[PDB]
């Protein structure tokens, strides 16, 4: 079982608990093998003339003692084992989320959200089940089975044991084959049921179309046809599922019958006694559970193995895309200066930014405009360390962006992405997200600066209500702006953050932000060119390259690109 070898760290880390569990399990096997032989001995000593009240009392006391010992030691060893499984689950979950938190957007481009959830919700289950239940089934199948076999062979007979054991291997093989076929047919039935769910989704999503064309009878006809198909698949499943109990009953009754009849014959030959015969049956009655276990063992191990690989496939082999390097002693950002940068995305065959070189000084404000798809946001993607370095050089003061540690860089920047993004928590928590719950008095200032106060007083207090799991594009943009502003960032990046609010509102927001932040940089990106009017630098992006570097007046006097000229083009 390669799963256990691959899982060596857990066992080496937790060795005492597993040694305790294994030792107690062998001991429990030994002390559970006794009561059957004791019952047989009571029967035998009964038939012989030697039997008194002292022997009866001895048997009763010893049975109570062994019952208590088995119960207590079982509680302890399997508490240990299954707690080890639970601990493995917890360790894998914490490890998985920790690995996720260190990953960059490229990892999520390569890994779908469902697949990550699939791993973290099924492969962890499989690996923990291996850890505990697969260990239990392995040790049972291997040691418990041989222990019962040997106890039969030595303390009863080797002639009855080999004879009355033939059925059980056959039973185990048949059970494994039935498990395989039932799993296959169950997958088929699940496919059919999923098809039914898909259809029932279309006919509830497209209710109006169906009803507007009086097709609410052919819809029922199709639904009935696929319900019949699902029934047929479930029937194919049940056909092979009904072979388990008949086969177990047949092949266990055959073993019981062989034991009983051949032991009667052996008694006739004086090679065996009545009590022994009873004991033998009890042993068989406790050798059936191992048989099932065998199959289960194989199953879980295989799953474990596969599952673990997938976990390890997207838990270790994916290294960080960005990392700090040799922290440079730069306390505050200076003047951002791109030097012929270029940035092709991992999933792009084009440069996506060609020899882009522009400079920003402290307290300066930058405006980026251009056609859709003109790397407007891509530029600031080069300033958040979300992707490989690119080319050229971004140097705050003189030090290249790589040298600055990621933590310090991300402490400088205040980022407001164009895509509205808020978490399931309260609005106040989203605002505190900038400082991570440091103080609350500045929340009012942040709300006022973004002009969200008017939009904050039209919902119930409710801890500033909740977002995500429980309300407007403009409101969302304003709360994101307040969150970014709460950081008091030295560099504030707004990316089409006011496309939802009106021109008056966005102009007021830009004015207030610029006034409050005088000595700190501010990138503004917007299709609406009226929000970058006051910026002292504007450069329009067209594909990979810039086209219209200059001030608002310079660009007005250079070329007519949107501006006020096309503002009334649609009006």
């Amino acid at each position: 079982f390669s799963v256990l070898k691959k899982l060596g760290w857990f066992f080496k880390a937790y060795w005492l608990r597993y040694t305790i569990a294994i030792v107690l399990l062998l001991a429990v096997n030994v002390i559970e093998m006794f009561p059957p032989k004791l019952l047989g001995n009571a029967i035998d000593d009964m038939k012989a003339g030697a039997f008194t009240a002292e022997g009866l009392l001895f048997y009763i006391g010893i049975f109570f003692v062994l019952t208590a010992a088995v119960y207590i030691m079982s509680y302890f060893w399997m508490h240990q084992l299954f707690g080890g499984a639970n601990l493995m689950e917890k360790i894998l979950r914490t490890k998985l989320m920790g690995h996720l938190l260190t990953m960059s957007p490229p990892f999520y481009e390569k890994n779908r959200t469902g697949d990550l959830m699939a791993r973290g919700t099924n492969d962890l289950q499989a690996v923990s089940l291996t850890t505990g239940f697969g260990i239990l089934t392995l040790v049972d199948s291997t040691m418990f089975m041989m222990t019962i076999f040997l106890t039969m062979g030595f303390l009863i007979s080797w002639k009855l044991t080999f004879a009355a054991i033939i059925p059980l291997p056959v039973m185990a093989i048949a059970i494994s084959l039935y498990g395989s076929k039932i799993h296959e047919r169950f997958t088929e039935a699940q496919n059919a049921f999923g098809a039914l769910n898909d259809r029932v989704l279309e006919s509830v999503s497209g209710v109006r179309v169906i009803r507007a064309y009086v097709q609410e009878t052919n819809d029922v006809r199709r639904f009935n046809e696929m319900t019949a198909d699902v029934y047929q698949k479930n029937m194919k499943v049940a056909f092979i599922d009904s072979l388990f109990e008949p086969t177990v009953k047949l092949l266990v009754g055959a073993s019981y019958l062989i034991g009983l009849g051949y032991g009667a014959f052996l008694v006739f030959r004086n090679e065996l006694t009545l009590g022994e015969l009873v004991s033998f049956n009890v042993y068989l009655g406790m050798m059936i559970w191992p048989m099932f276990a065998i199959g289960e063992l194989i199953n879980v191990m295989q799953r474990g193995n596969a599952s673990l690989d997938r976990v390890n496939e997207t838990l270790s082999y994916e290294t960080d895309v960005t990392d700090p390097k040799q922290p440079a002693d730069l306390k505050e950002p200076g003047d951002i200066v791109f030097s012929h940068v270029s940035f092709t995305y991992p999933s792009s065959t084009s440069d996506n930014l060609q020899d882009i070189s522009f400079t920003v000084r402290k307290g300066q404000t930058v405006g980026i405009a251009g056609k859709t798809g003109s790397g407007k946001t891509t530029i600031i993607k080069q300033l958040l360390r979300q992707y490989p370095p690119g080319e050229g050089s971004i140097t705050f003061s003189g030090v290249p962006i790589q040298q600055i540690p990621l933590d310090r860089l991300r402490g400088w920047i205040g980022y407001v992405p164009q895509d509205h993004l808020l978490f399931s928590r309260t609005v106040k928590e989203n605002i505190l997200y900038g400082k991570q719950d440091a103080t609350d008095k500045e929340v009012q200032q942040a709300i006022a600066e973004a002009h969200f106060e008017k939009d904050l007083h039209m919902l119930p207090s409710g801890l500033e209500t909740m977002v995500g799991e429980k309300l407007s594009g403009g409101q969302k943009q304003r709360i994101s702006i307040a969150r970014a502003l709460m950081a008091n960032p030295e560099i504030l990046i707004l990316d089409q953050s006011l496309s939802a609010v009106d021109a008056k509102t966005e102009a007021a927001i830009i004015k207030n932000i610029r006034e409050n932040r005088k000595g700190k940089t501010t990138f503004i990106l917007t299709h609406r060119l009226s929000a970058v009017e006051h910026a002292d630098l504007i450069l329009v992006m067209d594909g990979g390259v810039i086209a219209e570097r200059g001030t608002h007046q310079e660009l007005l006097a250079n070329n007519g690109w949107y501006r006020e000229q096309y503002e009334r083009q649609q009006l």
Binding site: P35, L39, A42, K47, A48, G49, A50, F51, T52, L56, Y59, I60, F63, F64, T67, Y71, S74, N86, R93, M97, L100, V200, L201, V204, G206, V207, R208, V209, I210, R211, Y213, V214, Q215, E216, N218, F223, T227, N234, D241, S242, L243, K249, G253, A254, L257, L260, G261, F268, R269, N270, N281, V282, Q386, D407, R410, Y415, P417, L421, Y433, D437
Partner: protein
């Protein structure tokens, strides 16, 4: 109502299959539990037969054994012949068998000193000369019993195979009953869905409707399988085993019956704790999944703000809680389940030893080792299903709530009773009489809307967002009832014609064209089964370029399985238009409030409209107030009330809202 009553009612259908399966199960249970009874008769009568008295008999006698020079025959086999005195015996002392060619009064502690057998029962009964039966001689006292043993073994095997056949039959038929009940229930629920108001669908997410239709029905299937296969099976099995026990012994059978309360109490307590632990595990696991999801989608903000430490801390809080409750569940499953099963089994062994040892010490010759063996086997059979029983008992609640959901869906009273299409054409005319529409209550969305449209097509209805245009669309199709005024199509009130009759006239084209998975032709035809090869109606819409582009949309290509995402939005709209033309309605309605333009696709869309509006009364709720330039009659909606009523030129000649919008 009650979910139990409803489940029993739905089972009463297929009651015949249930009865068949139950009778097969009873046959199997009897032909199974009889196996251990053969062993009791293969031991007490055959093996322990030598323990019974022997009498002298002649050699010619059948089933007579020659020990030294005298033939002896067992008392039970003695029958009428050779019924006399001078009995013999074969007693057991230690591991040896001793012949007593003499009558013995009592039985008790047997000791052999030297060719003597002293039996003591608290009064030192007597001593008798004893001989040893060696091995061959003792075996000769057993040879007569070989043939009956063979017969009993053959009976065991035959009854085994017979019971096995019937076990397969009963399980298969129980599964068949469950699946057929579930299929019928699904059909009933979906049919009831087709007769539900559009209000229900509007005020409830689709994923919840699909859930209640399908996933809760699968839960009901699991509940039926549980009940039939576990509860009924094990109840009948225990009934049979207790019958067998009372057949064997009554007092020990009562001791065995003293565990029904054990099972009941085990189930009660295990459920009491496991429901709590499992609910906590489920809620915390759902929380963990939600946290991992929101962090995966949003990590750029988890990292851009250095919130990684805090999000990890919260996830670890949830992880610790989940681990703690999992360990509590482990402690429960250790104090109960297989451990308590084994403890009860050993208590059973103790009870057997106590009872039979005491009976022996009474020295009444009532050992009956066969009874003990059969009891051991019956108790081992009895203990097998307890763990499954308790697991199912704990898990019943989820199925209970799912059944409640599905039955609440089934038992809705407010439904639409219709299904009568229109047998004649509409001719395309419609009128409104101050229809006062309020969605929920009080808050009116269309106040005194009164207008009339004639066979002339292209009647545009424009206005600002949230004005009442889609409410008008809903009223036209009777998705909702205006609860005031009236709407007349061709002079007939829509409230006095079957909803199917009404909708048989009017086609619909919406902002989001619903492209049901299937072929393009099946998408245009909606698998109506009456549409012939009339997909040229698409060619009327001028789709022609695309069928050349694609393999064969005319009922032979299936590019819609992906919801049409691969296809362009213009192509989706054109397919919806083709469907509208193919169904050849009379009162067409166009809800195209989509603010987007979908560059240049509008072009073909316009062409498409130009080929459909002819010979209908085309309502158009398209935006941009430019597609409606030539519309026969514009109508501006605001405040749920028609304020300006006139043509394009007339409205542009009076300024107002229409002029204001036109400039924008």
């Amino acid at each position: 109502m009650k979910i139990g009553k409803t489940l029993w009612r739905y089972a009463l259908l297929y009651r015949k299959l249930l009865i068949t399966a139950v009778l097969l199960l009873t046959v199997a249970v009897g032909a199974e539990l009889t196996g251990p009874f053969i062993g009791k008769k293969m031991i007490d009568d055959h093996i322990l037969g030598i323990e019974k008295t022997w009498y002298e008999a002649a050699e010619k006698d059948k089933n007579a054994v020659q020990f030294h020079g005298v033939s002896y025959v067992r008392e039970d086999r003695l029958q009428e012949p050779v019924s006399k005195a001078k009995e013999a015996h074969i007693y057991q002392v230690g591991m040896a068998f001793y012949f007593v060619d003499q009558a013995v009064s009592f039985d008790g502690n047997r000791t052999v000193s030297d060719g003597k057998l002293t039996i003591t029962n608290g009064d030192k009964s007597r001593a008798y000369a004893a001989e040893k039966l060696t091995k061959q001689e003792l075996f000769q006292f057993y040879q007569p019993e070989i043939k009956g043993m063979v017969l009993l073994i053959a009976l065991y095997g035959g009854l085994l195979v017979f019971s096995v056949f019937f076990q397969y039959g009963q399980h298969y038929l129980l599964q068949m009953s469950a699946n057929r009940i579930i299929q019928k229930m699904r059909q009933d629920v979906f049919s009831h869905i087709q007769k539900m108001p559009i209000r229900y669908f509007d005020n409830l997410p689709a994923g919840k409707v699909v859930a209640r239709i399908t996933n809760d029905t699968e839960a009901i299937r699991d509940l039926y399988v549980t009940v039939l296969s576990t509860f009924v099976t094990s109840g009948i099995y225990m009934f049979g085993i207790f019958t067998a026990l009372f057949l064997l012994d009554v007092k020990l059978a009562f001791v065995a019956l003293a565990i029904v309360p054990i099972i009941w109490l085990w189930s009660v307590i295990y459920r009491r704790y496991a429901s709590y632990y499992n609910q906590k595990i489920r809620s915390i696991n759902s929380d963990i999944n939600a946290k991992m999801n929101e962090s995966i989608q949003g990590m750029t903000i988890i990292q851009a703000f250095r919130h990684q430490k805090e999000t990890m801390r919260e996830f670890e809080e949830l992880n610790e809680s989940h681990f703690y409750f999992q360990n509590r569940m482990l402690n429960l499953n250790s104090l109960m389940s297989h451990n308590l099963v084994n403890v009860i089994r050993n208590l059973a062994f103790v009870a057997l030893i106590w009872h039979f040892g005491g009976a022996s010490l009474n020295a009444a010759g009532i050992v009956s080792i066969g009874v003990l063996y059969a009891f051991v086997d019956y108790l081992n059979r009895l203990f097998q299903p307890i763990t499954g029983i308790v697991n199912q008992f704990s898990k019943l609640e989820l199925a209970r709530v799912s059944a409640g959901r599905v039955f609440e869906l089934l038992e809705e009273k407010n439904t639409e009773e219709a299904g009568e299409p229109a047998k004649e054409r509409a001719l395309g005319r419609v009128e409104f009489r101050d229809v006062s529409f309020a969605y929920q209550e009080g808050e009116e969305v269309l106040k005194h809307i009164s207008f009339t449209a004639q066979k002339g097509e292209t009647v545009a209805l424009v206005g600002h967002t949230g004005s009442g245009k889609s409410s008008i669309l809903n009223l036209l199709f009777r998705f909702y009832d205006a609860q005031k005024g009236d709407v007349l199509i061709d002079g007939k009130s829509i409230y006095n014609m079957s909803r199917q009759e009404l909708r048989s006239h009017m086609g619909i084209v919406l902002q989001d064209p619903y492209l049901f998975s299937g072929t393009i032709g099946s998408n245009v035809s909606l698998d109506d089964e009456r549409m012939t090869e009339e997909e040229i109606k698409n060619a009327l819409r001028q789709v022609g370029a695309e069928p050349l582009l694609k393999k064969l949309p005319k009922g032979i290509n299936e590019p819609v399985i992906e919801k049409g995402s691969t296809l362009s939005s213009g192509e989706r709209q054109l397919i919806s238009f083709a469907r509208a033309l193919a169904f050849d309605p009379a009162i067409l309605i166009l809800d195209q409030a989509t603010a987007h333009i979908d560059t240049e696709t509008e072009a073909v869309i316009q062409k498409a409209l130009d080929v459909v509006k002819q010979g209908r009364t085309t309502f158009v709720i398209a935006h941009r107030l430019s597609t409606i330039r030539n519309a026969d009659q514009i109508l501006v909606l605001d405040k749920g009330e028609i304020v300006e009523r006139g043509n394009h030129e007339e409205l542009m000649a009076l300024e107002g809202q229409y002029y204001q919008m036109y400039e924008l």
